[PDB]
Design a protein around this ligand. Structure first.
Ligand SMILES: COc1ccccc1CN1C[C@H](c2cn(C)c3ccccc23)[C@@H](N(C)C)C1
Length: 358
């Protein structure tokens, strides 16, 4: 990777998120979104490092702070869609072409810290909240499918979550120091998703009933000793981090325990490796992976990028490379690889955007 360009957004506030559109069409340029202040902005990547500014959506409320965004597509038309959310607790579905807000959703109106789309169903949107719950939405029928919470759920803000390969289960994490597993391939959840697709409020008298899921299928506080602010599945293993200068690779149970035989009372974890780094001991710093999960990237609080090659036989054999530029000194809150991993974008606390090309 070589640094080919940078720019700064005019609001001068932190950029909390960046995401390439991995649903961009053949023959079209690569596009990424950034979120920070009360806006979302799209850019196209062009030759000679050019980062071409397109158009923003700016919230009507000057005090909105978008924290997260995620791409999907319309299941009938194929056109890409961009979901954004943050401090107001409003999920907006944005038409990226025109930057129109197509529609919006509200749970209880508390801040949303992360959005993720299901890996196999473009309509299933997971939101994680300041109010300690996760919410699963069906954005085809505009229904709240399920709320994951209760006293055995998270006990402080939920900061991140991730679906596994096939979207059979979710791992969530947050300020309570815990990581929690929630299976969504149970008979109950499969039925709830089916019912969400069969719901049309114009053809019935009933409201749509959301599931209350009050018991995780696994929970641990044994991985980290502070806020857990990013989680991703790596097959049946988990990668997670806190503010302790480490990404830990671990699994529920003992070494030979199958993830799908793990019971809710399981008290053990197994540590398969740990990727250490420096100067990333502030809260709220995200790592990202490429589409194929060959690579992992994390920025630190003084503008250094760490990239790990995971194309090795075991997690602890990951190969690290580092990327620095003398003008890049602000905290990097999130990174995003293009789908082919030819481009890596980093976004920062000073509203700067950094492009690295392979
Ligand atoms: C990059 O954001 C990440 C990264 C990992 C997990 C979650 C988030 C989203 N955050 C949005 C919030 C935030 C507000 N202000 C003013 C900030 C200034 C700096 C950083 C973060 C914030 C945080 N809540 C809990 C207060 C969580």
């Amino acid at each position: 990777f070589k640094c080919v360009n940078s720019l700064k957004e005019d609001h001068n506030q932190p950029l909390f998120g960046v995401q390439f559109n991995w649903h961009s069409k053949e023959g079209d340029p690569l596009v990424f979104a950034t979120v920070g202040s009360n806006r979302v902005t799209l850019y196209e990547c062009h030759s000679q490092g050019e980062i071409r500014l397109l158009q923003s959506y700016v919230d009507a409320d000057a005090d909105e702070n978008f924290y997260t965004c995620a791409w999907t597509y319309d299941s009938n038309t194929s056109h890409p869609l961009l979901a954004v959310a943050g401090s107001r607790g409003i999920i907006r579905i944005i038409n990226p072409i025109t930057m129109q807000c197509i529609k919006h959703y509200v749970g209880h109106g508390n801040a949303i810290n992360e959005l993720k789309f299901h890996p196999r169903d473009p309509n299933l949107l997971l939101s994680v909240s300041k109010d300690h719950a996760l919410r699963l939405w069906n954005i085809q029928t505009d229904t709240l499918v399920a709320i994951f919470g209760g006293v055995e759920g998270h006990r402080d803000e939920v900061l991140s979550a991730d679906y596994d390969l096939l979207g059979e289960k979710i791992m969530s994490c947050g300020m309570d120091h815990s990581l929690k597993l929630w299976r969504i391939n149970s008979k109950r959840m499969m039925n709830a998703i089916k019912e969400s697709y069969d719901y049309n409020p114009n053809k019935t008298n009933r409201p749509f009933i959301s599931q209350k899921i009050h018991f995780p299928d696994f929970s641990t506080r044994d991985i980290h000793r502070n806020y857990v602010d990013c989680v991703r599945w790596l097959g049946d293993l988990i990668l997670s981090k806190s503010c302790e200068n480490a990404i830990v690779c671990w699994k529920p149970g003992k070494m030979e325990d199958d993830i799908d035989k793990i019971k809710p009372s399981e008290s053990n974890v197994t540590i398969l490796g740990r990727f250490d780094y420096s100067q990333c001991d502030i809260w709220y710093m995200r790592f990202s992976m490429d589409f194929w999960q060959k690579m992992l990237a994390l920025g630190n609080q003084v503008g250094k990028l760490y990239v790990w090659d995971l194309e090795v036989e075991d997690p602890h054999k990951a190969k690290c490379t580092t990327l620095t530029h003398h003008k890049c000194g602000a905290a990097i809150r999130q990174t995003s690889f293009s789908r082919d991993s030819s481009i890596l974008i980093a976004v920062c606390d000073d509203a700067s955007i950094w492009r690295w090309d392979r």
